[PDB]
Structures are given as structure tokens and as C-alpha cells.
Coordinates of C-alpha atoms in Angstrom, one line a residue:
Chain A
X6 CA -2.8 -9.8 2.3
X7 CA -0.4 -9.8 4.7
X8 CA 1.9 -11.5 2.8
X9 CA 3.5 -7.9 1.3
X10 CA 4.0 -7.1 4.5
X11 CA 5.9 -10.2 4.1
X12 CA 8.2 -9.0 1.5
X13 CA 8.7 -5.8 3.0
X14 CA 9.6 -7.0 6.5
X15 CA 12.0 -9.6 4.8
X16 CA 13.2 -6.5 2.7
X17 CA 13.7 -4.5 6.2
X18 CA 15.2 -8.0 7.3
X19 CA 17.7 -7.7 4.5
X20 CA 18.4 -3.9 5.6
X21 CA 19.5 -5.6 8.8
X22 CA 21.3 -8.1 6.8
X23 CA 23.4 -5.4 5.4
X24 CA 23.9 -3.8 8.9
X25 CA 25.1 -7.1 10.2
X26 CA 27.3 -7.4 6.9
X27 CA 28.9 -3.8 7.0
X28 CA 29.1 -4.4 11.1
X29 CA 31.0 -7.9 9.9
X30 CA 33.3 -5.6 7.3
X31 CA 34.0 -3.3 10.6
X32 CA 35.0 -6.3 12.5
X33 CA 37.3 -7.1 9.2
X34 CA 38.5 -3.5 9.7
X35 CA 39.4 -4.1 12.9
X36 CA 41.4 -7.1 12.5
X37 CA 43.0 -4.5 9.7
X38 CA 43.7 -1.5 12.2
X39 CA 44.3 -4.3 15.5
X40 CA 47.0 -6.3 13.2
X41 CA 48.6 -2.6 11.9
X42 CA 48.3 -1.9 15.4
X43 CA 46.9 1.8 14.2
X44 CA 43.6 3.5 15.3
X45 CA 42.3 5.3 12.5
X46 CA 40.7 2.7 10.6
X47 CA 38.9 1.8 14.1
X48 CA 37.6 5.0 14.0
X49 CA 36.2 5.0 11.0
X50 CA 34.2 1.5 11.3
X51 CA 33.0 3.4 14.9
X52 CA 31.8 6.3 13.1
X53 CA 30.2 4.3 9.9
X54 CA 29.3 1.7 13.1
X55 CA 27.5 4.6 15.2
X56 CA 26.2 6.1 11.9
X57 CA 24.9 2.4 10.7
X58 CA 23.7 1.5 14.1
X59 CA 21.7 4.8 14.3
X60 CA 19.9 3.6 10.5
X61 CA 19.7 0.0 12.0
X62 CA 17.8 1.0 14.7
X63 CA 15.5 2.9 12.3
X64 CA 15.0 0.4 9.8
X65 CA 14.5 -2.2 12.4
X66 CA 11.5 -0.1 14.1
X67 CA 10.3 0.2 10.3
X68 CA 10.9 -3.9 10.0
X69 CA 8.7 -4.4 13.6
X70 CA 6.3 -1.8 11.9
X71 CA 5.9 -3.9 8.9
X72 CA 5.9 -6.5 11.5
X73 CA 2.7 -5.1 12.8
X74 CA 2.0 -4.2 9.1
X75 CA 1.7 -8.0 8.5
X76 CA 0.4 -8.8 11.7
X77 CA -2.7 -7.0 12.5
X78 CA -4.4 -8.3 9.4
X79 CA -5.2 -11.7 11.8
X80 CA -6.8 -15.2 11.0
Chain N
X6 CA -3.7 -19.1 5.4
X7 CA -0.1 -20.1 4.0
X8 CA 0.4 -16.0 5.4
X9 CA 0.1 -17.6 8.8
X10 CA 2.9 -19.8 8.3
X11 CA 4.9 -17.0 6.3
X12 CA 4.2 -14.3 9.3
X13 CA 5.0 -16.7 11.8
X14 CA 8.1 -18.2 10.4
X15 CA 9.3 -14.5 9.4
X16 CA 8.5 -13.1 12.5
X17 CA 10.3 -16.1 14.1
X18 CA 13.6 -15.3 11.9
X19 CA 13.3 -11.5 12.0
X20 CA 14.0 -12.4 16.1
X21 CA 16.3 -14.5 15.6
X22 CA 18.3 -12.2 12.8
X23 CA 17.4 -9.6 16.3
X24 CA 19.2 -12.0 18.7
X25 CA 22.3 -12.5 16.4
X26 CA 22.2 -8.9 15.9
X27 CA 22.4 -8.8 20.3
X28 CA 25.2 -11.1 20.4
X29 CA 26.4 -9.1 17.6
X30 CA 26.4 -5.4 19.1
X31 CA 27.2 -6.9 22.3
X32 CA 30.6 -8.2 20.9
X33 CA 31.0 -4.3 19.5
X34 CA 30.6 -3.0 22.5
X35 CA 33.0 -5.1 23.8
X36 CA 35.1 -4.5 20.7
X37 CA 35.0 -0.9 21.6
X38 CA 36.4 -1.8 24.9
X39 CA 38.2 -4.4 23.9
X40 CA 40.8 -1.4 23.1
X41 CA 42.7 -2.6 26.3
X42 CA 41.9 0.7 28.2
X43 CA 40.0 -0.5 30.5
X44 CA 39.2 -4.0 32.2
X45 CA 36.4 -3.3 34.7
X46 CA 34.2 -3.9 31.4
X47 CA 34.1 -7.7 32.6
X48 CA 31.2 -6.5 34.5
X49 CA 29.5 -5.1 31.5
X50 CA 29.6 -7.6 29.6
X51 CA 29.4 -10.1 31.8
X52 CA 26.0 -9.2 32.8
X53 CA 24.4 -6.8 30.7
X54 CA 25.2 -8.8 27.3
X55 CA 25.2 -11.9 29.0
X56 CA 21.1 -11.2 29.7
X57 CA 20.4 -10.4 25.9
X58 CA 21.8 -13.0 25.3
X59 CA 20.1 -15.7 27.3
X60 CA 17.6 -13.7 26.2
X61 CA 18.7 -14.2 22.2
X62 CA 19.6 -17.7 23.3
X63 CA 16.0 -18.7 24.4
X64 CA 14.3 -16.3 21.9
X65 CA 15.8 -18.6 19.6
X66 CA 14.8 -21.8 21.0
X67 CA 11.2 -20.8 21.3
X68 CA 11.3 -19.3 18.0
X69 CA 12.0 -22.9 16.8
X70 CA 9.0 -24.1 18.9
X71 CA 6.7 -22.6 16.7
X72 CA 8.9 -23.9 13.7
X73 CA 8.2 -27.8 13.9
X74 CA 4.4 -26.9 15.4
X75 CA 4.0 -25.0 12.2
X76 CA 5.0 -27.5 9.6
X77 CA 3.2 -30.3 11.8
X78 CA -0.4 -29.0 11.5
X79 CA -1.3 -30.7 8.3
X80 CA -0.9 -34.1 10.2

């Protein structure tokens, strides 16, 4: 039963997934602007980074709630 | 029953995803201030992301407790 729950937490798991990988692609980014020495391009990642963080905080809240989605349905 | 295991394992990686995800934002914070504009941030970090992650670290550890109890039940 709780086993969708399952797939949907591991769904919001791979939403963090992709927040980890586009925070990874800002580090990349940053190794971009750091080695051209510029600042835009770290401004950008920030901004996406802020704007990314902001929907990774959501979708983790939605994950812990499909966390508590899976986990109330005990034994 | 086999939703036990899949709860408890997911719940255990979704934590663990959570505690790279510290040690993740923690280094962008300190990429953020690892602009070279300020070096007082060794107290930041040196504290504030080093609890989440001794927290992340043990989270971690325990999560794998539950990992060989699991899979050892059927003995």
C-alpha cells in the first residue's frame, strides 16, 4: 500500500536528484566563470541556485510528505 | 511486508541523498563565499556546516544500521 508512496517519494528523491545534478552543473559553471575569472556566469548558477534551492526545498517537503504518505500506513 | 523493507531502506537513502545534499549546500555556501571577499567565513563553516555534517556523517552511519538489520531478519 504504501509501496506508491514508494515510487513517489523515490520520484521526489529523483527531483532532488536533479537539484543535486543542476547544483553539480553550477559548480561546473563555476569552474567556467572562476577559470575565465568573470562573474556573470556565477551569477546566473546563484540565481538558477537560489531559484532551484527554493523548488528543492519544496519538493523535498513534498518527498518527507510522501514520506509520511508511505509511512503512516504501519505494520 | 516487503513495503517494510522498501520504506525503510528508502527512507534510509532519501537521508542519506538529504546529508549529501548538506555537505552539498554547505560547500555552496561556501562557494558563495569562497568569492575571496571575505575570510571570517572560516567560522561559518567551520561550525555551522561542520554540525550538519557530523550530523549527515552519523545520519549516514545509522542509516546503514538499519540496512544489514533489514536484510538479516530472514535468518
Amino acid at each position: 500500500t504504501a509501496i506508491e508512496a514508494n515510487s513517489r517519494m523515490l520520484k521526489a528523491l529523483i527531483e532532488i536528484a536533479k537539484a543535486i545534478w543542476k547544483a553539480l552543473w553550477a559548480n561546473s559553471l563555476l569552474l567556467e566563470a572562476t577559470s575565465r575569472g568573470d562573474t556573470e556566469r556565477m551569477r546566473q548558477w546563484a540565481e538558477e541556485a537560489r531559484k532551484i534551492y527554493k523548488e528543492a526545498e519544496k519538493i523535498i517537503d513534498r518527498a518527507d510528505e510522501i514520506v509520511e504518505e508511505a509511512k503512516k500506513r504501519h505494520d
